């Protein structure tokens, strides 16, 4: 069926936060003008990943009911979703927001930034599988909100309070898949199936760190 006026208010409020968030021009111009080397390619990724942490906190702050949660759970939800939310945002940027040369130049930069092949190949297989879904900005905004408000995270004291905030967002997303994709009735299960693929990046990222920026060090280690 169709979204209720209550769900429309909830979607508009999420989009108000998500749509304002953009990659700065100084970083975008750096992808095309900076020198190509393993050290410089790694530096651009640090600047990008740092910017995402400020973007994540700003989006999470506006999520209805997040500010009413226990302070320790607020930190655990941010730390637990930092990696997943970044790759989901990376998938959106790598499959959409690119003029003519940025797409291929950034791929070359990621591949030649000193990150091992065992971590590189799953990234691009995830970007390609997500790109086949042909998701809209609404679906990206909701999936990010669902990734952040995950009650299954480690060291969460009040998991039920997280479940209460997540459930309205899964319901809006379920209704969106039925409306914009009625010919593919299994589209919703496919979106959630890509989340188990997103979760495998957590162990890959931890391994990559054992082999920055004050903000990145706090959210990671």
């Amino acid at each position: 069926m169709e979204l209720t006026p209550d769900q429309q208010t909830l979607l508009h409020f999420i989009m108000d936060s998500y749509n304002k968030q953009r990659m700065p021009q100084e970083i975008t111009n750096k992808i095309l003008k900076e020198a190509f080397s393993a050290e410089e390619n790694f530096l651009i990724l640090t600047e990008m990943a740092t910017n995402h942490v400020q973007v994540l906190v700003e989006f999470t702050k506006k999520l209805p009911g997040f500010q009413t949660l226990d302070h320790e759970d607020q930190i655990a939800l941010l730390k637990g979703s930092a990696v997943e939310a970044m790759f989901l945002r990376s998938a959106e940027i790598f499959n959409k927001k690119l003029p003519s040369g940025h797409s291929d130049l950034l791929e070359a930069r990621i591949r030649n930034s000193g990150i091992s092949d065992e971590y590189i190949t799953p990234m691009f297989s995830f970007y390609k599988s997500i790109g086949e879904l042909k998701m809209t900005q609404e679906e990206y905004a909701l999936l990010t909100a669902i990734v952040i408000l995950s009650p299954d995270r480690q060291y969460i004291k009040d998991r039920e309070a997280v479940e209460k905030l997540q459930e309205p967002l899964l319901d809006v997303l379920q209704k969106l898949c039925k409306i914009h994709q009625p010919e593919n009735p299994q589209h919703f299960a496919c979106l959630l199936g890509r989340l188990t693929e997103l979760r495998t990046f957590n162990h890959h990222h931890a391994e990559m760190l054992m082999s920055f920026t004050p903000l990145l060090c706090e959210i990671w280690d």
Partner: peptide, 9 residues
């Protein structure tokens, strides 16, 4: 620290 600042501002 930096997370709490960004969270509470």
């Amino acid at each position: 620290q930096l997370l709490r600042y960004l969270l509470d501002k």
